[PDB]
Amino acid sequence: ANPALYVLRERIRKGLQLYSSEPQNYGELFSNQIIWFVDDTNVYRVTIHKTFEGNLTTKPINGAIFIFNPRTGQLFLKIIHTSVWAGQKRLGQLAKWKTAEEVAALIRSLPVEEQPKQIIVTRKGMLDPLEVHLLDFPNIVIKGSELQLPFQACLKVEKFGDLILKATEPQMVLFNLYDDWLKTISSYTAFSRLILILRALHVNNDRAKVILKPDKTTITEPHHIWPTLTDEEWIKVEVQLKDLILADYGKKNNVNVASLTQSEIRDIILGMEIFSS
Amino acid sequence: NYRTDMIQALGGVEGILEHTLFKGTYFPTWEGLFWEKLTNAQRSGLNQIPNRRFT
Amino acid sequence: TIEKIMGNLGAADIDHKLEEQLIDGILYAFQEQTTEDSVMLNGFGTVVNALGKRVKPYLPQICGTVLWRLNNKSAKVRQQAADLISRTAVVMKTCQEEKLMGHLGVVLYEYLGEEYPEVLGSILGALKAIVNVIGMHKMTPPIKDLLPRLTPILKNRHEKVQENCIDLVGRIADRGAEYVSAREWMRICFELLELLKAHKKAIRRATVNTFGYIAKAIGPHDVLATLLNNLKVQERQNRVCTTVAIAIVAETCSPFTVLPALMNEYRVPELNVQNGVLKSLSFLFEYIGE
Amino acid sequence: MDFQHRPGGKTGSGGVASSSESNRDRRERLRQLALETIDINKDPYFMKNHLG
Amino acid sequence: LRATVRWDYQPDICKDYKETGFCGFGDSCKFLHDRSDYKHGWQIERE
Amino acid sequence: FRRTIYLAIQSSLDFEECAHKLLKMEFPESQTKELCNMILDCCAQQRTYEKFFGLLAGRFCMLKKEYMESFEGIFKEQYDTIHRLETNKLRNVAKMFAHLLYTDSLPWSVLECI
Amino acid sequence: KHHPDLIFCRKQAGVAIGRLCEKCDGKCVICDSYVRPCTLVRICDECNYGSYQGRCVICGGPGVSDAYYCKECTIQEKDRDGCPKIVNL
Ligand SMILES: [Zn+2]
Ligand SMILES: [Zn+2]
Ligand SMILES: [Zn+2]
Ligand SMILES: [Zn+2]
Numbered sequence: 001a002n003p004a005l006y007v008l009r010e011r012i013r014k015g016l017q018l019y020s021s022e023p024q025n026y027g028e029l030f031s032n033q034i035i036w037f038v039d040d041t042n043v044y045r046v047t048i049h050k051t052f053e054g055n056l057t058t059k060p061i062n063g064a065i066f067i068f069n070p071r072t073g074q075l076f077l078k079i080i081h082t083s084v085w086a087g088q089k090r091l092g093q094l095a096k097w098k099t100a101e102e103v104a105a106l107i108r109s110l111p112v113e114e115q116p117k118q119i120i121v122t123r124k125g126m127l128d129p130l131e132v133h134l135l136d137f138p139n140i141v142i143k144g145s146e147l148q149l150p151f152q153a154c155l156k157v158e159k160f161g162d163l164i165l166k167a168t169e170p171q172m173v174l175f176n177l178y179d180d181w182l183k184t185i186s187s188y189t190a191f192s193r194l195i196l197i198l199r200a201l202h203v204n205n206d207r208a209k210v211i212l213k214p215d216k217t218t219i220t221e222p223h224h225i226w227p228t229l230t231d232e233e234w235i236k237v238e239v240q241l242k243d244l245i246l247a248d249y250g251k252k253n254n255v256n257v258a259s260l261t262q263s264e265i266r267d268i269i270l271g272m273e274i275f276s277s
Numbered sequence: 278n279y280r281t282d283m284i285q286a287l288g289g290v291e292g293i294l295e296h297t298l299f300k301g302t303y304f305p306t307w308e309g310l311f312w313e314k315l316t317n318a319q320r321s322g323l324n325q326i327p328n329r330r331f332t
Numbered sequence: 333t334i335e336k337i338m339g340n341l342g343a344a345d346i347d348h349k350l351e352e353q354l355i356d357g358i359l360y361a362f363q364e365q366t367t368e369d370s371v372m373l374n375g376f377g378t379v380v381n382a383l384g385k386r387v388k389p390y391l392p393q394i395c396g397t398v399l400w401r402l403n404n405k406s407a408k409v410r411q412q413a414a415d416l417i418s419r420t421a422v423v424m425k426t427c428q429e430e431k432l433m434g435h436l437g438v439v440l441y442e443y444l445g446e447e448y449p450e451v452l453g454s455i456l457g458a459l460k461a462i463v464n465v466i467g468m469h470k471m472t473p474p475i476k477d478l479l480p481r482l483t484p485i486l487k488n489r490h491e492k493v494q495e496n497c498i499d500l501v502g503r504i505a506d507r508g509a510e511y512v513s514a515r516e517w518m519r520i521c522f523e524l525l526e527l528l529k530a531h532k533k534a535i536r537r538a539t540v541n542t543f544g545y546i547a548k549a550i551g552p553h554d555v556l557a558t559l560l561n562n563l564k565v566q567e568r569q570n571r572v573c574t575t576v577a578i579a580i581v582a583e584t585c586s587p588f589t590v591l592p593a594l595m596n597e598y599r600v601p602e603l604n605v606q607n608g609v610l611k612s613l614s615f616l617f618e619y620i621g622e
Numbered sequence: 623m624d625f626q627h628r629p630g631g632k633t634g635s636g637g638v639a640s641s642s643e644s645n646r647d648r649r650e651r652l653r654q655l656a657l658e659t660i661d662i663n664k665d666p667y668f669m670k671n672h673l674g
Numbered sequence: 675l676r677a678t679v680r681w682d683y684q685p686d687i688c689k690d691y692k693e694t695g696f697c698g699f700g701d702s703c704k705f706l707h708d709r710s711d712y713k714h715g716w717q718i719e720r721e
Numbered sequence: 722f723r724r725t726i727y728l729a730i731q732s733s734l735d736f737e738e739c740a741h742k743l744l745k746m747e748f749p750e751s752q753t754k755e756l757c758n759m760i761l762d763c764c765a766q767q768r769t770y771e772k773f774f775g776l777l778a779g780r781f782c783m784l785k786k787e788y789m790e791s792f793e794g795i796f797k798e799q800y801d802t803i804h805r806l807e808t809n810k811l812r813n814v815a816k817m818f819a820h821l822l823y824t825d826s827l828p829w830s831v832l833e834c835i
Numbered sequence: 836k837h838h839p840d841l842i843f844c845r846k847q848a849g850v851a852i853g854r855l856c857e858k859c860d861g862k863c864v865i866c867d868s869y870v871r872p873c874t875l876v877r878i879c880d881e882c883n884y885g886s887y888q889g890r891c892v893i894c895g896g897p898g899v900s901d902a903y904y905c906k907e908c909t910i911q912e913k914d915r916d917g918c919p920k921i922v923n924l
Contacts, residue, residue: 001392003435006399009303011442013403016330018302021405022309023363279731286728311405313447314489316638319629322702480709483695519695526640537861565646603674618907619870628702633690635698 024147025120026195026270029070030188034116036076036140037068039151040130041122043080043099044091049275057276060086064164065099066151067106068177069116070191075177075225077160078102079167096126100133102170107137115139122148147272149191150198156205157225179224181238184231193238196269197226200241203248211240242269249274335375343382351383355390359397365412373412377419388427394420395436407448414443414454418461425465434472437462441473444481449490456485456496463503475504475511483516486523494530498538505545514550521546521555525562528577529570536573544580552585560597563612564605575608579616587616681715722752726759736777740784753791756781761795764817765810775820782826792821793831800834836867843892844918848877851884853920856896863905864892864919872903879918892920 013019029035047061063085067076078099088094107115121127121142130142154177155161163173176182181193200208212218218227218237229237242265246257249268260274268274287293294300294307304310334354343351358376365372380387387394401413417436424433440459446452463471482504485497501520504512524539547555559581563574582590598609660668688705691697697707713721725746733739748756760781764774781788799814806814821827853864853876861869864876878892890898904914 001396005303007435007438007442009301010399010403010439012298012302014442014445016298016302017313018304019311019405020304020309020400020403021311022306023401023404023409282728282731285724286732309405316641317700318635318637318698319631319702321629322631322699323623324701325703326701477710480695483709516695566642567646568642601670601672601674606673618868621870621907623704631698631702633698637696637698 024272025118025145026070026147026149026191026267026272027188028118029191030186033118034069034071035118035120036074036116037066037070037120037149037151038103038130038140038142039066039068039120039122039149039154040096040099040126042066042152042155043085043096045085045155051275058086059275062164062167063095063099064155064160065103066154067103068120068149068151068154068194070120070149070177070194071116071187073176073178073182073190073194073226074174075154075160075194076106076172076174077155077164078106079164079171079173081167081169084170092126093129097129097133100130101136102172104133104136106172107139112139117141119143120145120148122151147267147270149195149271150202153198153201154225156198156201157220159220159222160225175223175225178226179220180228180230180234181226184234192266192270193234194226195271196238196241196245199269199271200245200248203245203252207244207248208241211244212237214240238269245269335372335378338379338382343379343384343386346383348386351386352390354379355387355394359394362401362412362416368408370415373415373419376416377423380420380423384423385427387423388429391424391427391429391432395432399439402443407451410446411448411451411454414440414451414458418454418458421458421461421465430466430470433462433466434470437466437471438473441478441481444485449488449493452485452488453490453492453496456493456500460496460500460503463500463507468507475508479504479512479516479520483520483523486520486527491530491532491535494527495532495535495538498524498527498535498542502538502542502545505542505549509545509549514554517546517550518554518558521558525558528573537576540573540577540580543577544584547581547585552581552589556581556590556593560593563608564597564600564602567604571604571608572611575612576615578608578612579619582612582616583619587620678719679715681719683716685714722748722755723759726756727763730763736773736780739777740780744784750787753788754795757788757791757795761799761814761817764813765806767813768809770813770816772820775817775824778817778821779824779826782821789827792827796821796827796831797834836862841921841923843921844879844882845916846879846918848879848915848917851878851880851882852876853878853892853902854883854889854898855893855900855902856891856898857900858896859891859893860900862893863908864902865908865913865916866905868905868907871906873906874904874909874914876902876904876914876919878920880920882918882920882922887920894921 025035025037043063043065045061045063047059048056049059050056060082062082063080065078065080067078068074069076080095080099080102084098085095088098115137117139119140119142121130121144123144127142134142155164157175160173160175163171167173178190178194178197181197182190185193197208197212200211212227214237218229218233220226220228227234227237243257245268246260246265249255250257250259260268264274284290284293290307299307346354358372358379361372362376383390398413398416402410404410404413417440421433424436437459440455440462443455446455479501482497482501486494486501488494488497505517505520521543524542528536528539530536530539543555543559556578559574559578563571563578566574578590578594582594594609594612598606600606686705687710688697688699688703688707691703691705691707692709695709697703729742729746730739733742743756757778760774760778764770767774778792782792783789796818799818803811818827822829822832855864859867861872863869863872876892881887882892890896892898892902902919908914
């Protein structure tokens, strides 16, 4: 944004007489388009702590940047250090740029086939440093579509949350967001089930835990986020999670859980529009 | 198809734009780009302007 | 409805975050302004003028988006952006952002080589607004750096371009006579002699006004000699406006000087110059009165 | 650039003016041709009025 | 403080266009069409 | 490999120049079946059959024997996969195997697959 | 600039205010001059009231400005002559 630079650029553009004519995602994963949902909304993650006094301090907990390949349910939680998620000036720019540089280093370490053709990014709130530092990972285009995923609840898994919490450095863990929902369903249904688990965990974590793990038989693995179940058990857990998410949405918006249709309930599941020193 | 493979034989659009003055324009992409009763003492003069902008 | 509510009540009850959200909403509306909706342009100007001095934080991202729309393939998009500049020049100069106004004047000076006439007329009206709102010794580029650029623009054949350019020359020859030589002023008069054959009577009236401004500026001798040459030479479906311009040159600049030249030009037997002398006499007597 | 094969144009000329100037120049040329024929005829019947 | 720089000492502005506002060659103007009077590099180096 | 093969084919005016360019760039013999594949596909893309590709196939048969064996194996494989191709594609592949056999570039011994 | 036809009303001016369009703005309503526009135009009738609301009292454009008599016409006091809004006949 230098003004004289724009004068020089516009002199170049008027000399060339060149113009600018130029001024869903949960379901496109099985439509021959790999989408790795690069979301940094959980990047500035901080825990809550209380001292012996009435004042409450801010704990610099380890942030986790979500990269959700929804075709296979692959959740790459790029972890940060405990001292790297707080302290630096311009945390909406510098820490976002450092997380984007770590994501670009991970995309360079992974193959081009391992990288996706698109990135299901969130709304543009901190996307300026991401678009600045996304020149090293241009295979996936970051944009905010109509169908997103609740990446703020992507760290709500027990094993992934423990691996994020017990990490004093950028561990950058990788797991499956839907380990059992992808072994018994399609790619779009697996992305919808993982987004349904994430949306139910964002709405009501107790109802999401009772829906996904109603007993001890749904105990997942150390690299699994969704509960480990069979085909019918995973379908029943996803149906109970969708029912709990519809009940929470109806309680939030003074509506009914059964008021949504089949495609509307599928879109609501998939995430679319229905201490100190 | 000859035009498409003629573009493909030139090392790519990015390789062509490396040769041209593309990065001085500071466009985000090339895809938005678009190209474009009187009396006078002489009228058959050559137009220096489009050759100048090609240069 | 929001524009009428802002014109009724005002922007004093609007908070800054709600004002920023409304600015983003009307900028999205100008983004998806597909039709020729000048009513939302007027509402844009109404809401920003009701904001007043509070839009000075909001200025540079709005200016950058308008300049981004000014790089469009579509002519009408850049035309509407220049119309928004013409609407917002006054509220830009309310806070007197002189560096931003001079930078936009330099960018529009680069934009002056537009090949589209509606875009050119919108740019010219924006420059009319900008020169009217900056102040005299504070625009970049200055008047002597602008009127040689403006000189071949008056040779255009399009009516809206001619009207806006003649209006801008009228404002320049009204205010800034202290930068352009009288050689270039009577060259502009030589251009306006050909430009008096335009179809619009408002264009010819503003041409008469520019002739009066130049006669007030540079002196009434050579312009009266030029018009006395032109009026006997026209002899067509024009030149009543030449008599009107001659009357304004006399009336603004003391007709006791002009009257011996017109009285000697009455002695030319060329069958239309005497009619021009008498028409200018009737118009001049009607203009001066008592 | 064919400098020696350019069309005819010299600096400091001014260009071709408006068609009204050419029309009144043609009227002046026709006036001179009429005056040449009048002087060839030597006719006193022709007169110029005070209004032209 | 020696700052002698070999410039381009041939300003190819159209002299007819620069002080009139009009060139007869027009599109065939071998020089460039501009009317300005800012200082050249050798004139600033002399200044 | 496909890009280089197709660019050399469309750049080469003659099959002599094409085979000389391919012997200039010196591909290994592990991909001679792929070379036969992008010969048959480059004739399959043609609306009308051109003898350019057939002469190239015959010259590949008559320079070295390994291209001839690759053409025999891909001819048996093309007879195994006749039905995957459309009518003009099968027309062009039939003209390939004709221009291999009336020019004697392939033997008639592999024709017992039919 | 006038016509022998197209009389206006010749009816005595009342409270309905005259109104000028942009196409003939600034001229006098009678002699079409521009010198000292002094007296407001009243158009006597339903020339303003009703269908011709905010319209030109001359040629017929969208009326935007208050029509004025000039001081040359009010020298002979032609402002009292009545309605100048054109009724076509
Ligand atoms: Zn020139
Ligand atoms: Zn009057
Ligand atoms: Zn009117
Ligand atoms: Zn009336």
